[PDB]
Amino acid sequence: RIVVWFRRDLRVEDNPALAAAARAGGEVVPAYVWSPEEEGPYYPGRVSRWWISQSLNHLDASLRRLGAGKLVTRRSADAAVALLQLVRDTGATHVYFNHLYDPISLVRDRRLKEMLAAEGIVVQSFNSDLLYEPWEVVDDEGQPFTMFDPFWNRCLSMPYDPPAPLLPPKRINSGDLSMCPSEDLIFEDESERGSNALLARAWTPGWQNADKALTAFLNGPLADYSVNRKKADSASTSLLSPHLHFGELSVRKVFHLVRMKQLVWSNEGNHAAEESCTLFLRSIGLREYSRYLSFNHPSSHERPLLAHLRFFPWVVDESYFKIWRQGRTGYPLVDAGMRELWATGWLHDRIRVVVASFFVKVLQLPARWGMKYFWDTLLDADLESDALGWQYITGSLPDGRELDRIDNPQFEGYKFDPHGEYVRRWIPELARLPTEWIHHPWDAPVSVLQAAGIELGSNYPLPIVELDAAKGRLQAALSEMWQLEAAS
Amino acid sequence: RIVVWFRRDLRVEDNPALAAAARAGGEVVPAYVWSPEEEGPYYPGRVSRWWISQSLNHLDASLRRLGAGKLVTRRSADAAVALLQLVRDTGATHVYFNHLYDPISLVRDRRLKEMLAAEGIVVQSFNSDLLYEPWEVVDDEGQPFTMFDPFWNRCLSMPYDPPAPLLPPKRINSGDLSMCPSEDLIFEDESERGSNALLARAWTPGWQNADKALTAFLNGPLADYSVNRKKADSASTSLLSPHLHFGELSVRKVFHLVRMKQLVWSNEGNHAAEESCTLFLRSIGLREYSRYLSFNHPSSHERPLLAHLRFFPWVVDESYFKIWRQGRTGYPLVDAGMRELWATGWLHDRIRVVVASFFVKVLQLPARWGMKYFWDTLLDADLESDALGWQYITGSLPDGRELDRIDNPQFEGYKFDPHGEYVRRWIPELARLPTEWIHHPWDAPVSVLQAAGIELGSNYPLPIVELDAAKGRLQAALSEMWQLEAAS
Ligand SMILES: Cc1cc2nc3c(=O)[nH]c(=O)nc-3n(C[C@H](O)[C@H](O)[C@H](O)COP(=O)(O)OP(=O)(O)OC[C@H]3O[C@@H](n4cnc5c(N)ncnc54)[C@H](O)[C@@H]3O)c2cc1C
Ligand SMILES: Cc1cc2nc3c(=O)[nH]c(=O)nc-3n(C[C@H](O)[C@H](O)[C@H](O)COP(=O)(O)OP(=O)(O)OC[C@H]3O[C@@H](n4cnc5c(N)ncnc54)[C@H](O)[C@@H]3O)c2cc1C
CATH class of the missing domain: 1.25.40.80 (Serine Threonine Protein Phosphatase 5, Tetratricopeptide repeat)
Structure with missing residues (x-):
């Protein structure tokens, strides 16, 4: 009688769609359709897919213990098509879901309301996220x-x-869904399954x-x-x-x-x-x-996400992007976080600020590049939250962080890692390097770096870009942007 | 502006009267009116009066942290006359409270609504008990x-x-309370304050x-x-x-x-x-x-509480009552629980029936008598729930317990105390009595009693009334009454 469509509400407590379907009286068909092609560039990345594969299995058992046959898993490139096959296949009267707020879902989901209301389905959406x-x-x-x-x-x-x-x-009443089939969803490349499963060490x-x-x-x-x-x-x-x-x-x-x-x-x-x-x-x-x-x-075309950095001349350098992903930049606080992001799929918010600020302030690579990597490596990769973070660190918001400015790595180190124990946990090479230079090894005397057993360039990399070069190139890039901006 | 009248809702979380008053955006004057005269035969017990005064200081303290000036206290025989007098002194506009359901308050509250409405006071009551x-x-x-x-x-x-x-x-704000006065309430008699304080050992x-x-x-x-x-x-x-x-x-x-x-x-x-x-x-x-x-x-006159044994021949024996009060009955499980009741003002439910079933089916004294003792010595002395509990053991309603029947103490003991450790803890005199006899020492061989150092009559009392002599008395008292029943 009622379909409950799961999307990003994979819980059973305080889930207004599922809790109102159950209290309507009739049956409840709980289902999830995997329509990533609808997400365009925001197609769920590698490790976020690994989460859903476990979260859904986990939500399946939860649902089954409450009196369900299954969570119906449908596959498609259009969600309405798969959703209204299911309203037919499983023959329902209603379709319930909790509404999201990202720009993709906002208009895809109002195409579903009408698409489904044209074949006689009553639709209701609820608040589950705010x-x-x-x-x-x-x-x-x-x-x-x-x-x-x-x-x-x-x-x-x-x-x-x-x-x-x-x-x-x-408990929920589903009726016989021995009829209704579920499409075996594919979330993982065979080639990646063995390294994806190591994410369970931490999560x-x-x-x-x-x-x-x-x-x-x-x-x-x-x-x-x-x-x-x-x-x-x-x-x-x-x-x-x-x-x-x-x-x-x-x-x-x-x-x-x-x-x-x-x-x-x-x-x-x-x-x-x-x-x-x-x-x-x-x-x-x-x-x-x-x-x-x-x-x-929302993102428009009249003014996009990072619209204030339109004429910003970015460094295009795939070599630099490779060093950043591998945490071989030579900036220890940055490398330490880039190693942990790869190993666990998660970063403390301030290490996110550090690695992303470094990306657009020192290497000055297109923020898009780093926005995409984040999307493939973060377990919590979230459309609006990622947009807000990158908008914050690049200074598109008035709230946001200053544009014409680079953080001294010691400022970052003393605030987020005062004893250097974050660097030492993720870069054991520098364990014996004192706190006084652990966030800027390039400034240490050779004696101090020899005592720490560090050879900058063999044992641990040299600064891929030096701060004073980064600041000089930042003022030259902004002046280039500001003379261009007035030319319009 | 608003006056929150506290009665039996001594809390801040999920207090609808308080929550509704705070949300109105005005001022919130909390208050307690002590009017025990209005409860007549249900004047609050001795140990219940101690708990209240503990709880009010606790609640006052938490109210002030929320921004209130104080908890206002008023002493009068009529609630309304005090509640009216308060909002006169404060210039209040509303009076919120949470409605109760005992037959006393249902009528006293209802008259307050009309009385206060007449004088121009906006009044609303909320559910918080059920x-x-x-x-x-x-x-x-x-x-x-x-x-x-x-x-x-x-x-x-x-x-x-x-x-x-x-x-x-x-937060709650109440404004200036320096003229708004509170008269100190007296919940304890001076000669009992010390004996009352020891209740804090357990609560x-x-x-x-x-x-x-x-x-x-x-x-x-x-x-x-x-x-x-x-x-x-x-x-x-x-x-x-x-x-x-x-x-x-x-x-x-x-x-x-x-x-x-x-x-x-x-x-x-x-x-x-x-x-x-x-x-x-x-x-x-x-x-x-x-x-x-x-x-x-509710029960007042045509079927008051325990109306079915209107015609019961109660043993009017103040001596036996006192022996039940002091836990000197010779039935361990009865004596144990009767000690704890006096000690900590609380009893387990099943022990609440053991000492109660015994009070009316073995000693066979007026159930109204042991009711007034429970009222004076239970901290959770509750009008409706005490009513239900007695109705249950006397068999006054179809859910209740079988009337012509007396629990064998070893049945009670095996369900409520398999190893006799409950009465060993409250009757250390019986500590050496092996578990087999611990709930019925009078049936033990003299050789066992002396091996445990027990001497019935001097060390631990002899059973004041025997079971055989009591179920016998039970038949003679029940058919005498059923004879009185079919005769009117
Ligand atoms: C460049 C950049 C990218 C980011 N990308 C993401 C992302 O993909 N997904 C994501 O959830 N957060 C993102 N954030 C926000 C923030 O880094 C994370 O919310 C936080 O690190 C998650 O850790 P936590 O759960 O322990 O947070 P806590 O400090 O424990 O906070 C509790 C919860 O509050 C929310 N929250 C906290 N800070 C923020 C914030 N700044 N913006 C939005 N929600 C917040 C999260 O749901 C978080 O779980 C990003 C921030 C930046 C600067
Ligand atoms: C003769 C007699 C008198 C009683 N007098 C009272 C009394 O004055 N006040 C009182 O609150 N209870 C009374 N009861 C009910 C019961 O004995 C107690 O509620 C219970 O033993 C208290 O322990 P607890 O809070 O750990 O109960 P739990 O096992 O924790 O029960 C949870 C809560 O449910 C309620 N509850 C449980 N059992 C009952 C019950 N049978 N009747 C009503 N409420 C119940 C209580 O609020 C209790 O705190 C009486 C029972 C009998 C047989």
């Missing part, structure tokens, strides 16, 4: 916000709270593991988040991002659970933990703002 | 239930889940401690509630009893958290633990049924 809908939060003239601070300040002062997380169905995809990681963070490093959130040398953050990208966890549960921890800590005098919750919710609000930006000010 | 309101769960012809099982299975198949718990106010009243107790049960004995809920030789139940009576913990939060614990365990193959939450929610539902029976079938 505390507040993007249209629900505006300024005093009713307009979208343009910076993050006024926007998040509004959500924190909204006249109602984010809806409480719904319970899962008591376990699934609604169940997302829930255990949240109560692990809530009862652990959340109390110190106020003071440690920027450090990459301890597990200072929640490690929930891939779980949240695929919707395996409610953000409305996280909001509600964290607000309860705050009330208790406030009654215990734990003032530093109370601010920890304030700051961690802000990080949850940055995910809200990523959707708010892609909905209210 | 999963569903009683007038929502009816049979298929729309009439109230009369047995527990059909009621609870309708609550469990109800078309909508019980409302998820509300968030506490992020710390307060919503925070209710929260911590719930977290402790969920991560602890809840998994083993299916096989151990009857045992009293260990901490097998939640011990959330007095917290839930004073509304220190939202039952709706308990429901949602347990239901979600059920889902994770089911998915983990932990069937026993899954089964355990089923029974634990049933115990929550018994508290729902407690308000159902008092809302639908």
Whole structure:
């Protein structure tokens, strides 16, 4: 009677589509269709595909234990085609899904509403990803916000709270789907299966593991988040991002659970933990703002993503891109993160800032290139969140980070790795190199680098581009961009 | 502006009156009116009066951290006269509270609404005690239930889940309270304050401690509630009893958290633990049924509580009552539990029936007598739930226990205390008595009693009333009454 279409909500708690299909009375057919060709350039990358293959298997058993035959797995190049074969094949009255906010889904999914409503299907879409809908939060003239601070300040002062997380169905009734077939989905090249499976050393995809990681963070490093959130040398953050990208966890549960921890800590005098919750919710609000930006000010053609860097003369150099991917740049904080991104599919947010800032400030390679690599290597590769991050580090946002400027690697090192233990964990070659030079080995005297057993150029690479050359080329590239910009 | 009248909702999370008042955007003056005169024969007990005063200081402290000036306290024989007087002193506009369901408050609250409306006061009441309101769960012809099982299975198949718990106010503001005065309430007589304080050996009243107790049960004995809920030789139940009576913990939060614990365990193959939450929610539902029976079938005069034994020949013997009070009855399980009741103001459910079944079926004293003792010595002294519990053991309603019948103590012991460790702990005199006789020492050979250093009559009392002489008396008292029954 009702189809529940899964997309990026691979959970069973607080899933309004599935919870309303079950409470309608009739049967519920839960299904997922793999239509990546519809995603154009944003076709899910290598390691994100490896997550879905485990997340779906994991969500299958969850569904089956609640009284389902299966999760129907359909394959297509058009989602409507596969979806309305299923409404026919499995003969339903309704199609329920929770609506997304990326520019691809926003118009593909309104082509589905009409396509399906022309063959008599009733369609309803629900909120599964945001505390507040993007249209629900505006300024005093009713307009979208343009910076993050006024926007998040509004959500924190909204006249109602984010809806409480719904319970899962008591059980779901699917009927006999012994008839209905499921297409064996292919997510992994045979050639890559053996290295993709090593991602499980660090991660376990699934609604169940997302829930255990949240109560692990809530009862652990959340109390110190106020003071440690920027450090990459301890597990200072929640490690929930891939779980949240695929919707395996409610953000409305996280909001509600964290607000309860705050009330208790406030009654215990734990003032530093109370601010920890304030700051961690802000990080949850940055995910809200990523959707708010892609909905209210989408990529257009009149003005694209990185539109302020149109006439920026990028260095085109595949050699440099190869050194960056391999973490052989010779900048230890960058190399350390590029090694961990390849090995685990994840990076602390500030190491993301470092590796991406280095990409467009020192090597000054097309940001597209690095945006694509991120898409193939991140387990939490998220359309709106990746766009917001690259927009932030390149200075397309007014909120964003300054354009005409390069970070001193010691500034990065002292903030995200003060004792150098992040570099030493991922680059053991430099273990015996003192903290004083571990983030800029090129500046150390030969005696100090010989004591550390480091030969810059054989044991560990030389700086592929020197800072002073990078800054000189950055001013020459921006002046080139600014004389060009006025010429229009 | 708004005045939040606290009664039996001593908590900040999922307090709809408080949440609604805070969300109005005005000012929120919290207050407690002490009017025990309005409860007549249900004047709050001795140890319940101690818990309240502990809980109020706890709640006042947490209110002030939220920004309130204080918790306003008023002493008057009539609630309304005090509630009116308060909003006169404050210039308030509204009076919010959460409605109760005992036959006293249902009528006193209702008159307050009309009385306060007349004087120009906006008044609204909210549900905070129950999963569903009683007038929502009816049979298929729309009439109230009369047995527990059909009621609870309708609550469990109800078309909508019980409302998820509300968030506490992020802040409350009340303005200037320096003229708004509060008169210190007196809950304890000076000569009993010391003896009362020792209740803190076993209980710390307060919503925070209710929260911590719930977290402790969920991560602890809840998994083993299916096989151990009857045992009293260990901490097998939640011990959330007095917290839930004073509304220190939202039952709706308990429901949602347990239901979600059920889902994770089911998915983990932990069937026993899954089964355990089923029974634990049933115990929550018994508290729902407690308000159902008092809302639908209240008792005053034509069928007052225990009307069926109107015609019972009660043994009016104040000597036997005192021996029951002091746990000197010679029945260990009875004496053990009677000590703990006086010691810690709490008793396990099954021990609540052992000392109660014994009070009316062995000593056969007025059930109204042992009712007033429970009222004075139970911290979780609850009008509706005490009503249900007595009706259960006396057989006053079809769900109840069989009347002409007396539990063999070894039956009780084997279900509630397999190794006799419960009474060894509360009656260390019997510590050396082997388990076989520990629940019936009078049937032991003198050689065994002396080997344990027991001498019935001097070391540990002789059974004040024998069982044979009591079921005999039971027949002679029941047919004398059925003879009186069919004679009118
Ligand atoms: C260049 C760049 C690329 C990024 N790409 C991604 C991406 O593909 N996917 C992604 O989820 N995040 C991305 N981010 C944001 C941020 O780096 C990650 O959210 C964070 O590192 C995930 O780790 P965590 O779960 O421990 O975060 P926590 O600190 O534990 O935060 C909790 C949750 O808040 C959300 N969140 C936190 N920071 C941000 C942020 N800046 N923007 C949006 N949501 C946020 C995430 O859902 C995260 O799981 C990117 C940032 C930059 C600068
Ligand atoms: C004679 C008699 C008198 C009672 N008097 C009271 C009383 O004054 N106050 C009171 O709250 N309960 C009363 N009960 C019910 C029961 O004994 C207690 O609720 C329970 O033993 C308290 O332990 P717990 O909180 O660990 O229960 P749990 O096993 O943890 O149960 C969870 C909660 O469900 C509720 N509950 C469980 N069983 C019952 C029940 N049979 N009836 C009503 N609610 C129930 C309680 O709120 C309890 O805290 C009485 C029972 C009897 C037989």
